[model samples]
Target: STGSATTTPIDSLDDAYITPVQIGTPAQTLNLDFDTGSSDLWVFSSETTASEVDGQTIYTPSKSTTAKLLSGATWSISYGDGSSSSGDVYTDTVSVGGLTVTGQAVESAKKVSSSFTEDSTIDGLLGLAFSTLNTVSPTQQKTFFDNAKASLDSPVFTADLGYHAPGTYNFGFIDTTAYTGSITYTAVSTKQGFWEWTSTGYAVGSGTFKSTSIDGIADTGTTLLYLPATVVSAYWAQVSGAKSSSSVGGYVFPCSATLPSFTFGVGSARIVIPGDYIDFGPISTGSSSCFGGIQSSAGIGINIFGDVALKAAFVVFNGATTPTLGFASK
Candidate 1:
């Protein structure tokens, strides 16, 4: 069987892509960030204290007849950023798009960091990365994809994220019409539990494509594209008057500047990210200086082809015995 679901941006910035997922029997619908960079299906729940709840929706396991406590089970997740959340675990019927899985592990957050409390758009996160990274203690649980992949007509899912518009996530079969040309296949390295792969190389605008391999993970949860320092600097150098701002934290340029597009290779196929997409929003509200959507990954210690790059193409996560990633222009 196959299933699909629409995912929309939380805001104009395309800060995050969220999809509606049903949990438990009566189906408590929550907007969850489908992140391919991590493995943990956690949620804001009744267990979270009022001070930490804010305005986001919370999953109340008690309301669901199918909800059962995973006694003696606990979970914790840490992010590259200082923010984090941790809590006890539960098993319940969980559904994404139209795919359903019974006895799915669901971590109910008892404590969430300040960043999560203040961030009002997302209620929780649905991890799409390899289940090996699951943080559930004693026995790590499988992700929604991991649980549903076997039942799917094909062991795969595709991400079709849009720029400030609604997109779709499809499982089981690839939609040929969703992308143009042929997809470039790349072997996935999941040792780190990420959708990690190596790209052929990159080019700034119409410049020549450097025949070098850039290792990175495709992270749907991240807001910006983080590449090695050399790649980042080359792209920024093309934008006139662009300058790195320590005070603001990234390279910022005049909002009116017409920036150059960035092109990265998947084998011989080139996926070009439009210039405007790289010209991220202003440094501050009503500010004239805009931040670059592509930044250096030096601090993170890993290259990440985040949403800024993902939005430019259709991505397929093929969950075959030896997994692979397929990229194609749309």
Candidate 2:
């Protein structure tokens, strides 16, 4: 039941959400997203009062050299869904791939509940996505990436998303300013990340998936790739035996089915939304259930590109200069 991973921008303290924070050997790698939508890095803990925090990922300070508690500071967050968690803040040295951030802030939720607690196998998340949404900033400022930018081997982080197939979201080397392509710039609308009028929509794989050149926004904080009704049904129509499984949400299908390759029309240019990424959730039972591109809104607006869509292209977020996005193939 794992969904895709995506990133978003944070403009407030409440935007920084927590994720499973895993600590292992330097040789071992940790793959996570820095969520600026919420605050504090939290995972399940061995010392957790099992009854207090159930179905969430925990951390063991003894497993890493960089773990410390933030005195008795208590933290709590409740989602719009009425789900929430609470814990104590701490400090630890966190590592992702070859990069390591020390004296990093963390939270150990003594209690938690929501789609996050029982939905997946991930013990928790690494909330390094954005800063505007961060909760523990000095003025509710400085995201994990914002702080890392000062010392990262690179200046920016990029994300590549595809269907079914896994893609990558990179950090550091804010190289959007370093690209040499005849870049196409689009103006953003008031809807935030929604792709604006000048924004690009694409179609791929035999011209099966198509959508009106409407406003589409790019957000790193969201976790799912969203689309309009016309777009979702169009995709499901192309698939034999595919139909709406629910009144809300995206078009779902059998996981084992041969999903067609879809193309996205990015402006006058067409970019293929790899078939691997469209596969959505894994195959359950004999036929896997796939959620369509459209989903019911929970006051969060349309669908989001979750992490699933990010693993395919080299995504660049250039907030320092032109505030433009740069895309390239890995």
What are the C-alpha RMSDs, in order, of all predicted structures? 0.8, 7.5
TM-scores of the models, in the order given: 0.98, 0.67
Which lDDT tens digits does candidate 2 get at residues 139-185?
A: 34344455556575545555544333333445665434433343343
Candidate 1 lDDT over 1-330, as tens digits, reads 788999999988898989999999899999999999989999999999889989999999999999999989999998977889999999999988768999999999999999999989999999999999999999999999999989999999999999889999999999999999999989899999999999999999999889889999999999899999899999999888898899988889989899999999898899999998786788889999998999999898889999999999999999999999999999
lDDT of 1 at 174: 96
- Candidate 2 differs from the real structure by a C-alpha RMSD in angstroms, to one decimal, of 7.5
Ten contiguous residues minimizing lDDT sum, candidate 2: 9-18
Model 1, which residues run further than 4 Å from truth? none
Q: What is the C-alpha lDDT of each candidate?
A: 0.93, 0.49
The lDDT, on a scale of 0 to 1, for candidate 2 is 0.49
